[PDB]
A and B are shown apart, each in its own frame.
Chain A
Amino acid sequence: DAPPLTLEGIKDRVLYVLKLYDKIDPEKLSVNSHFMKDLGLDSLDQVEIIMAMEDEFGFEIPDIDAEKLMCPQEIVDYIADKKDVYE
């Protein structure tokens, strides 16, 4: 019960959830892609993406922290520091 999670699995799952988005493409999606600068999306898209990961990982990320999760590596960093990976 309660299997542990590894950081490679964390970025695999985050890229999996990102790669199913219809306002994104699975070609130029990378782990160091800025959402509006290097990818070209909206702030509404940003908060909705944050809500999508909040539904995916089963816990609530506050808005003060949610405004700064701006790249997939930063989302992986926040999940990593929240869930205490590499123990």
Chain B
Amino acid sequence: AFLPSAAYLTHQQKVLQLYKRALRHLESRCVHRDKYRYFACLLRARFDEHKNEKDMVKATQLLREAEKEFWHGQHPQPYIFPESPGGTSYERYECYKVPEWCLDDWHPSEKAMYPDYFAKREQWKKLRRESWEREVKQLQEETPVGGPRTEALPPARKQGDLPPLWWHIVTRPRERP
């Protein structure tokens, strides 16, 4: 469907996604732990009934009818974790995730009260500006004709070389500022 590395979802991935969503919806509909455990064992037995199959078309519309049945028997209000999207606490503290580059706009009066941290930040900035050239040199040659086919990035190859395009992942803001 829409994945970063693969261009499609295989049959195994579809089955596992259906199993996980079915377990989540069954846990939502079966609030008490023991009823949920019993019906999870029943659902695992039902899934293992058709595990050993040799015809791909049979697995195809078996998965179609299973997804239709799961759509019919879903919870209208499924349980959502607080940090998951759609939850009550989703992307809340993202309002407080101030990016690091704003620290480059501070006054020298308020930069003098954190000397050591700003010295270490200067060292990190120097490391970034000396690693950018060799990281783009690494990414230029490794890229084949027509650009990269997948979104996966090559890792660090030579000793002393940082991975390409690493700044906006390593220096991303913390979860709890």
Contacts and interface: CB of A to CB of B under 8 A. Distances in A.
A48 interface: yes
B168 interface: no
A44 B20 contact: no
B4 interface: yes
Size category, B interface: 20 to 34
A41 to B, nearest CB: 13
A63 B13 contact: yes
A58 interface: yes
Interface in A17-55: 43-44, 46-48, 50-51, 54
B16, B80, B84, B175, most chain A CB atoms within 10 A:
B16
Interface string B37-58: 0000000100110010000000
Contact of B19 (A47, A60, A84): A47
A44 B48 contact: yes
Contacts of A63: 13, 16-17, 20
A43 B12 contact: yes
Given A59-B84, A64-B4, A44 B19 contact: yes
Interface string B49-77: 00100000000000000000000000000
A66 B47 CA distance: 19
A64 B81 contact: no
Interface string B1-36: 001100000001100110110011000000000000
Interface of A: 2, 43-44, 46-48, 50-51, 54, 58-60, 63-64, 66-67, 82-84, 87
